[PDB]
Every structure is written in C-alpha cells, then in structure tokens.
Amino acid sequence: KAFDLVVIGAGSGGLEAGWNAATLYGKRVAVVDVQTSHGPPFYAALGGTCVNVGCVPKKLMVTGAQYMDHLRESAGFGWEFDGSSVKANWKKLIAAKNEAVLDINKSYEGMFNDTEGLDFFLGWGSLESKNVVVVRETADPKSAVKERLQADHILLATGSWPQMPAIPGIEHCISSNEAFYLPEPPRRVLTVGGGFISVEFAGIFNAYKPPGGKVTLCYRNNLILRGFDETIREEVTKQLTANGIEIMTNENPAKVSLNTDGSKHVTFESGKTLDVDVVMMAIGRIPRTNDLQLGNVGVKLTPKGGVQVDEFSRTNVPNIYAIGDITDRLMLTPVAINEGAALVDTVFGNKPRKTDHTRVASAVFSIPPIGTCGLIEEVAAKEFEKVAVYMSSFTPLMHNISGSKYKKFVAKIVTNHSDGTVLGVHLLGDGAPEIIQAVGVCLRLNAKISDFYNTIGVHPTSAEELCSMRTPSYYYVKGEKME
Amino acid sequence: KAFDLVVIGAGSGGLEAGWNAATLYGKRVAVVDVQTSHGPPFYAALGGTCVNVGCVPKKLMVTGAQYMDHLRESAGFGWEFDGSSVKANWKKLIAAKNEAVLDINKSYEGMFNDTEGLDFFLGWGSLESKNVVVVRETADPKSAVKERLQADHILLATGSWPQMPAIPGIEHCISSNEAFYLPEPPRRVLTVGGGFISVEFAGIFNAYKPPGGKVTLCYRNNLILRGFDETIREEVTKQLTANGIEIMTNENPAKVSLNTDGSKHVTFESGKTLDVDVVMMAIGRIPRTNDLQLGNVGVKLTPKGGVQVDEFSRTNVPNIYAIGDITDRLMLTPVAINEGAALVDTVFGNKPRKTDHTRVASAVFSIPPIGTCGLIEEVAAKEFEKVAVYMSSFTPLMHNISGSKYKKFVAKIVTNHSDGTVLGVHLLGDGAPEIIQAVGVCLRLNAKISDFYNTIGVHPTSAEELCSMRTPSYYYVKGEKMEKLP
Numbered sequence A: 001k002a003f004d005l006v007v008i009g010a011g012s013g014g015l016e017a018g019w020n021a022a023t024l025y026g027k028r029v030a031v032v033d034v035q036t037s038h039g040p041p042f043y044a045a046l047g048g049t050c051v052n053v054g055c056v057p058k059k060l061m062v063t064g065a066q067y068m069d070h071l072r073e074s075a076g077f078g079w080e081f082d083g084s085s086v087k088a089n090w091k092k093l094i095a096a097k098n099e100a101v102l103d104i105n106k107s108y109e110g111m112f113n114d115t116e117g118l119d120f121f122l123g124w125g126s127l128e129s130k131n132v133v134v135v136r137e138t139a140d141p142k143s144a145v146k147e148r149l150q151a152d153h154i155l156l157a158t159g160s161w162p163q164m165p166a167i168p169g170i171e172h173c174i175s176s177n178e179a180f181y182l183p184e185p186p187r188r189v190l191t192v193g194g195g196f197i198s199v200e201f202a203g204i205f206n207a208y209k210p211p212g213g214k215v216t217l218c219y220r221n222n223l224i225l226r227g228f229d230e231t232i233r234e235e236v237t238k239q240l241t242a243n244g245i246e247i248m249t250n251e252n253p254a255k256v257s258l259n260t261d262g263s264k265h266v267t268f269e270s271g272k273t274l275d276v277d278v279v280m281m282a283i284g285r286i287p288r289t290n291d292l293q294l295g296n297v298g299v300k301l302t303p304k305g306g307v308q309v310d311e312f313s314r315t316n317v318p319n320i321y322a323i324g325d326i327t328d329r330l331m332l333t334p335v336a337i338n339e340g341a342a343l344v345d346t347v348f349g350n351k352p353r354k355t356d357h358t359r360v361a362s363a364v365f366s367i368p369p370i371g372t373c374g375l376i377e378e379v380a381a382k383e384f385e386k387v388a389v390y391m392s393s394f395t396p397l398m399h400n401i402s403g404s405k406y407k408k409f410v411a412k413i414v415t416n417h418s419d420g421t422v423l424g425v426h427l428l429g430d431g432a433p434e435i436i437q438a439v440g441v442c443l444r445l446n447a448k449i450s451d452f453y454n455t456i457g458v459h460p461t462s463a464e465e466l467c468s469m470r471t472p473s474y475y476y477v478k479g480e481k482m483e
Numbered sequence B: 001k002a003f004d005l006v007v008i009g010a011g012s013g014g015l016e017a018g019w020n021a022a023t024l025y026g027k028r029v030a031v032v033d034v035q036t037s038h039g040p041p042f043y044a045a046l047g048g049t050c051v052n053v054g055c056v057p058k059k060l061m062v063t064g065a066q067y068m069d070h071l072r073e074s075a076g077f078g079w080e081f082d083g084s085s086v087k088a089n090w091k092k093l094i095a096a097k098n099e100a101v102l103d104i105n106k107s108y109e110g111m112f113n114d115t116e117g118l119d120f121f122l123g124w125g126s127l128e129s130k131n132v133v134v135v136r137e138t139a140d141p142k143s144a145v146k147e148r149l150q151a152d153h154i155l156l157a158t159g160s161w162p163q164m165p166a167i168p169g170i171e172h173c174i175s176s177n178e179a180f181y182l183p184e185p186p187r188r189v190l191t192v193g194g195g196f197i198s199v200e201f202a203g204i205f206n207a208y209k210p211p212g213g214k215v216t217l218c219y220r221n222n223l224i225l226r227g228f229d230e231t232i233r234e235e236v237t238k239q240l241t242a243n244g245i246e247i248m249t250n251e252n253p254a255k256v257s258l259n260t261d262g263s264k265h266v267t268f269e270s271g272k273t274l275d276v277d278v279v280m281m282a283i284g285r286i287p288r289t290n291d292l293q294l295g296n297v298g299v300k301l302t303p304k305g306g307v308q309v310d311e312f313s314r315t316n317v318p319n320i321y322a323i324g325d326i327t328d329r330l331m332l333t334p335v336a337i338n339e340g341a342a343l344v345d346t347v348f349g350n351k352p353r354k355t356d357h358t359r360v361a362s363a364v365f366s367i368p369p370i371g372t373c374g375l376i377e378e379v380a381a382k383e384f385e386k387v388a389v390y391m392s393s394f395t396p397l398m399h400n401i402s403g404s405k406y407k408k409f410v411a412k413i414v415t416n417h418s419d420g421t422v423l424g425v426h427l428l429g430d431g432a433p434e435i436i437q438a439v440g441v442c443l444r445l446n447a448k449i450s451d452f453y454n455t456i457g458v459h460p461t462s463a464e465e466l467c468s469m470r471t472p473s474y475y476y477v478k479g480e481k482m483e484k485l486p
C-alpha cells in the first residue's frame, strides 16, 4: 500500500505529524505502533509513552500521592477525622489510572477510524528500503510480514526506552514501565536515579506505601536533579527527606539478589545493603532505534543510538526524518509535538520551521513540584559577562499553619545583568508547573526583570514573588559569584 | 514633629510609600494608624485591610475550606477513611488565622522600630492644614490631640470600609470584618452581594457549616461577578451550586428581624423570607474620607466619594497625594502598592512613573478560583472593530477521577483580531490565580495569540491550554457576536 507519509510510532510526535499531514496538508498517512492499548507486554502503545506509561498516568498518581499531605495538612485548618481509619488504596489508584489511559487509547482508535487518509497499522515497523516500511508480527526481523508500506516520506518517531545497568540481578529490577502495573504498593522500594522519574516515583510510593513502609532513592552524584537550579536541588532533597524519603547520594547498586522470602537484597558499590520489595531503575532513557533495521537504508545514528538530525529533523537520507525522543534532543511530549508539527509544515507546507529547544518551560511533579524555564545561573555565568540572580525563598504562611514548615517556596530569576534580559526562571513549591507556563511566553518575548517587577502582582499567590523582586540577591561576573 | 512625608493609614499603599521613601531616598516619614494589631474595635490595623481583615486571612480561610473538597476527592485516588468522623473545626481555623495575622502585625512593628526616619503614630489622622496632620485619640474631631505632624508631603491611604444598606434590622447583619471573628461557624448563612467577597465567604462558610447547614448567596441582579468573563460567571454559579451553595439572583433583603432564638428572619424585596444564623453584607466598599476632615484643606472628592487624583496620585492640593482604595478605582492590594511605589519613585526619586490600571492580573478565591488579566470580550468588542475569542473548556482528567465532574476548567483569550494582540485572559479552575500572574507580564509586553501558541506547553498542566489555542471560537465584528468573520 502507498502513502505520502509513513510514521513509525503512534506517540506524542508521530500523532501530531500524522494528523497534521493528513488533515492540514491532505496527505495520505500511515502510522504504525506495536499495541492499541496500554500495558504489558510492550507498555507504550497507540498514544505514545506519555499517554500510556509517562506524563498522563504519572501526573494522576502524583495527584493521588498529594492527598497524603492534604489529609495531614487539613488538621492545621481545623479538619478532624479518624487518622487510624486512613488507608491509601493503591489498587483503586491503579484501576482509576488504567481506565483514564484506556479511554485515551480508545479515543485515538476512534480518531483513526473517523479520519480519512489517516490509517493505523498494528505491529513492528522497520525500514526495508528508503521508500518501504515493513510492519512485522514482532521486534524480531524474521517474524511474519503484516504489511509493506510504500512511502514517499518516512518519519521515525519510536521514542525512548528505559536504560537498565548490566549489573548482576538486573532481572530482579523493574523500570518505570512495570511500576505503573505493580498490583500492590511496595512496603520498601529503592528508586535508582536522581532524575525526575526517580524523584516523582519516590513521591508516589512514599504516599501509598503500607504501614511501616520505607522509600529510598539512590543517586551516584552528590545532589539529585542535575540540570535544575542548585537551590531547588538542595530544597527538594530536604523536602523529600522531611516527608520520610531516604535520599542516598554518592550510591549506586552493584548487584541485586533475592532473599529467601523473595524480597530484593541490594548491595551498593559502597557495600551498604538495603532489603526492598521493589528496585525501580530510573537511570536514563535511550532512543529506540534497535528494531528499526536502519542498516537497510543507512540512516546516520549517534554512538548513543539516537537518529542524528539537522535543525529541521532531517536524517542524512532524503525523505526520512526523525522527531521526538528518538533524536535525544529534549525528551518532553510538547517538544516531540512541536518537532512533528514543524517537520510536516516544512516538508508538506513548504513553511520552513525548526523547533526552538531553548527557553522550554518544564516541570518536575515532585512533592512539592518544580517549574522551570531557561538557563540555570551556572550555565548563564559561562555564557554572559554579568549575571544577576533575584531570589525569594520562605515557608509560605499556609504551610506555617498546615505544619509542613519544611515546604520552602523558591523563586529565582536569572538575568543578563548588562540589559536585564531574563535567561532563566526556576520555581519550587505548590503551583510551580502552573506558574511557569506563561513565563515561557515571557522568555519568548525577551522579557527583562523590569517587565516582571513593573507588572502588578496577583495577591495572595506564590506567583507574585516573580513580580516583587527589584534587587539582585547576588551576581556572577566573568563566571565568578559575588555577593 | 517635622516630616518629609506623613502617611495616614499603615496599609498596603501607605507602608509601601512609607518604607520606600525611608529606605530608598533616606526620607523622614510618619505613618498614622488607629490600631497596632488586628480585630475589634477598628478591624484594620498596622499592615492594613488586606493583612488584618482581607486578602491574607481570607486566603488562609479559603485554603481551609478547600479541604472539604480534597477529603472527598481523595477517594477517587484510593484514599479511604471514616467519612462519618470528619468534622470542620472553625474555632481551630480562626485561632490559626489570628496567630498568622498577629505575627504579620508584629513583623511590621519590627520594620518601623528597625528603620531610621520611619516612625509609627497611633490614633486618628485628619488634615488641619496643607502641611499639618493632627493625630487625635478618636475619630471625633473633638477628641484629644496626641500629635501635630508637620509634612513637606501628605499621603492619604486610609483605604475603604464595608457599605451596609440602611434597611430595617441592618444592626442584626455583619460585614466581612465580623465574619473573621465569628466564635462559631453559622449553620445557615446568607451572603448578600454578587462580588468576590460574598462569593469567597459563601465558599468558606460552605466548608465549615455544622451538620444540616445551608449557605445562601443573594444578588440583586441576574448573574454574580459583574466585571468578570460571562462564561466564567455562569460556570462559577454552576460550580458553587454543585457544591451545595444556593444562589438567589434577582433578590435583595428589604429587612431583617431577630427571631426569639437569636436567628435572623430575612425578608426580601420579592416577599420571600429566609431564616439564617448569619447575614453577611458584601454589597460594596466605600472610601474612608469622612474622618480625614478633607473640607478643612479643600481636597476634592468624586461623584462617588473617593479622593480625586491625577495619574500621579496628586490631589488638587499641592503636597497632598492619595493612593489605594480611598481613590475608589481598582480596590486591590498590589494596585495600592504599585501606586505608593510610583508616587515615591516620582516625588522623592525624581523618576516620575504612573501606575498602569490596565492589564491588571487579579483573582477570585472561589472554589474553584478565577484568574483574570485585562479586558472581557464585551468591553473589547466596544473598543476594537474585530475581536477574536479563543476558548478551551473541559473537566480536567483529575476531576473525572476525583468525582467533581462539575469542575469545568475555562481558558479564554480575547484578542484584537486585526493584529493578534491579547486584550484579556480569563481562567476558571484549580491554579487559575497562579497561572494568571505571568500572563500579566505577557500583556505588559503586548503578547499576541501567536506568542502564546508558539510557546511550548508544560505538560501536563491546565496552564498549557493557553499555549494550545490557534483558532478563534468566535468573534465580535463592530460589536456583533458571530461564529465566523465575513
């Protein structure tokens, strides 16, 4: 069968691309994915990683985990109830999450059924030749052929996959993929990794753990959440700790064996030991290029295994493009979507457009959460002669009453002190992901600190901190910090 | 006894002007207020209306009220407990709020002690002459003079005060002032008014009411929250109704009598009656100009009672300025603060600057809340030939699971369709007040709809809806609503 466009991977970026090419540019579009609904065996499915085993379900589960804080915090505001009657029913959370995800699966299924010139094929897509995608029964390239798709243009949009360290007893560990389907909440869990997935799951497990349970997070480096503002890294560490999570920094699993009762016995490189019910590996995500048989067409890969692309998402092979996590640029759903739209505009619209991967608002749904956009000060300080940092940090008043006095709000604006241009905004605290969105629009408009402090605050909010900072807290001059 | 600046009212506007003048321009400042800490008899005190009986306590009490929804909503996420054991302890809330407010009162007292040339005087400020403020023991111009302050410059910042309709039995009613100090949560309460104060208090009372409780909100016209986006006004109405609040529109109390049990028998203009434990009037606030004896220096007031000011907060009388709610414009703390900051950066910084009263981000801590910045479409439609309305409205997924299906999120962007310039942004839903703040920065920067849609979303958030809207839902063409442009 012959298509203007064949998309391999029905995820965030692949669906934006396929829908746009079919509906905006009237192209005949094929999209391939390995599953029509979420979960084992392949986890991602129609809708992509975000829908099935990422942003959507994780946000629902963090929302669930937040009620542990709300129930406790209610008491400061006079709420009374039987504390000993309180149970976090993980089974109900997972069932609620499963229905929400399946509903999305079903709506995408209906989208394909109802959208003419947009066709879904089930199975494993690989490149036979530069204008032929082959859809097979399994990831094994010797499995039965279901379809052979003639394609003027081919989009690679297969996303990423959890990285598992080749350590002894790796087989006794899970990734985030399995964590979404645990039938029971682990009493003891080790999250391995200092990144958003490890931190976010540490919070989920911490809220739903059965009585006398314990969540441990381990990270090889000295301070979790590299890439984030350093004050926020230190505070999120303190605030996880204050809510009963054990943060093991400078620690990495050397191996895992089973205790006789089937629990996991962890030996760290330091020779510390930890017995847990679950070991969740969240140490990285790698582009999914193995199954694509890219050797058949000579698409250029990085040693990492990403598809190398120009700024327009073009491979070295004419008519073959890649967007989203498979490109290893920024692994966020809205970025994959933006890359997919820009690619289709460029190729089928002759409306040349590239995704700006700078000044991208993002969030960590830690408890409490992070919202960030643009450069951290250390990075700005290497690129700009004079950098100013405006900082406001304090326990919000509601958290003096709630009894969570450890919940320090942090708001930091990083500027080019030579002209006041805002380079980065970094927030930690309730509402941070919601606050930062319109800050993304500010950084696109080259907002200066004067644009923030001359804007009238909304009161009372956490956000108004951003519009109340007149005077730098400190500077970097030629890369050096000056009070 | 001689000051560069004398400020009457140690409130949102007065303290910003006072502090800035002292710390930025090393000026010598007297600030007058009638009370050093919150509550009866005068309610406002050191820190002003917002701190003592406004934004600050209101927000703590709405946060308390929100736990009624969180406790219920938790069940959808698997939280289990004895719902029959749930009690809302209003007495606990009010003690916690009192302690919170007193700490802020004491924190401002510290500010005045620890600041050279910034001094607090206790008592009632009035104007004797163009350059003399007298501080008296009471609001009576005949009470004892505690002080005579000479002033190169005089700032009036005495704020506002609740209006009580002169109906028979108004003495059985309270304002928001008394609501902060009720010893017990009313079982039955009538909030009178369709504005943010009546709406916010209906939410608060609704969460803390004892068993067999009922919150009724009445409003004299057809739809609450005049001046907000119409879609949001209708939606808040539904969402308050869905959470058990009774909205009586086209209704207004004609009188109140005490029943023998101390309850209130409200008779409406329509002839309807209602028994309630509390009648809270929230029909408006009026500038506090009476007690300043403004007739003594001929400071001009408006056809409404607010101190007349130019764009620089200058009265008709040289050396005399007015900021905040006494000017009877936008009654918001950050506007009062902006006016004070501008007035002092102007008069003492020699850096003239005027408050922009357009494109002001504001909120209603309704449950769920409103966040808004700039023009509603009806207003835009009268100023601009072609207005586009971009609208995204849905129950967020978390609220399909929570069981609060009625919590429809609303995001509306109003543009000048001629150039795409965003004229207003109107949000209803959890986090709306937090979302809207950086939208105020966007509007200052003359953001277009294309600046919103070309910005990459933060996922998953409600806020990313603002960056997902590319196509108008409908238009106004020369004042006329229509699906499609000609």
Ligand SMILES: Cc1cc2nc3c(=O)[nH]c(=O)nc-3n(C[C@H](O)[C@H](O)[C@H](O)COP(=O)(O)OP(=O)(O)OC[C@H]3O[C@@H](n4cnc5c(N)ncnc54)[C@H](O)[C@@H]3O)c2cc1C
Binding pocket: A008, A009, A010, A011, A012, A013, A014, A032, A033, A034, A035, A042, A044, A045, A046, A047, A048, A049, A050, A051, A053, A054, A055, A056, A058, A123, A124, A125, A126, A157, A158, A159, A160, A176, A197, A288, A291, A292, A323, A324, A325, A326, A330, A331, A332, A333, A334, A336, B459, B460
């Ligand atoms: C736990 C977790 C949480 C996350 N949270 C967030 C968040 O909160 N916000 C955010 O913005 N991002 C988040 N992300 C990242 C986000 O999920 C990804 O950036 C995004 O899904 C990538 O989109 P994409 O189009 O590159 O690929 P994906 O959405 O991953 O889609 C790839 C698809 O290709 C399919 N596939 C793979 N190989 C083949 C093949 N050979 N043939 C056919 N189909 C194939 C897969 O089944 C999958 O559906 C999260 C990720 C994870 C793992």
Ligand SMILES: Cc1cc2nc3c(=O)[nH]c(=O)nc-3n(C[C@H](O)[C@H](O)[C@H](O)COP(=O)(O)OP(=O)(O)OC[C@H]3O[C@@H](n4cnc5c(N)ncnc54)[C@H](O)[C@@H]3O)c2cc1C
Binding pocket: A459, A460, B008, B009, B010, B011, B012, B013, B014, B032, B033, B034, B035, B042, B044, B045, B046, B047, B048, B049, B050, B051, B053, B054, B055, B056, B058, B123, B124, B125, B126, B157, B158, B159, B160, B176, B197, B288, B291, B292, B323, B324, B325, B326, B330, B331, B332, B333, B334, B336
């Ligand atoms: C219930 C309620 C909720 C509110 N919620 C919000 C909100 O969430 N967000 C928001 O932005 N705004 C809110 N407001 C409005 C906000 O409180 C005001 O806009 C703000 O306080 C006005 O500041 P100001 O400087 O005009 O005066 P105020 O802050 O009102 O200060 C005036 C002060 O002057 C003193 N005073 C009066 N007369 C004299 C005299 N003769 N001599 C000496 N001292 C005198 C008073 O004691 C008072 O302390 C709310 C108001 C109320 C009533």
Ligand SMILES: CC(=O)N1CCN(CCCc2ccccc2)CC1
Binding pocket: A392, A394, A395, A396, A397, A457, A459, A464, A465, A468, B333, B337
């Ligand atoms: C608890 C705390 O330390 N902070 C929270 C409040 N922050 C608000 C700053 C702006 C503002 C708003 C309204 C009145 C005045 C000023 C300042 C820092």
Ligand SMILES: CC(=O)N1CCN(CCCc2ccccc2)CC1
Binding pocket: A333, A337, B392, B394, B395, B396, B397, B457, B459, B464, B465, B468
């Ligand atoms: C009906 C509903 O629940 N809505 C919330 C999500 N809205 C889309 C937000 C942007 C986005 C993010 C990720 C994939 C695609 C688009 C659309 C409206």
Ligand SMILES: [Br-]
Binding pocket: A221, A222, A223, A226
């Ligand atoms: Br580190």
Ligand SMILES: [Mg+2]
Binding pocket: A111, A112, A113, A114, A115, A116, A117, A118, A119, A120
């Ligand atoms: Mg179809």
Ligand SMILES: [Mg+2]
Binding pocket: B111, B112, B113, B114, B115, B116, B117, B118, B119
């Ligand atoms: Mg002093």
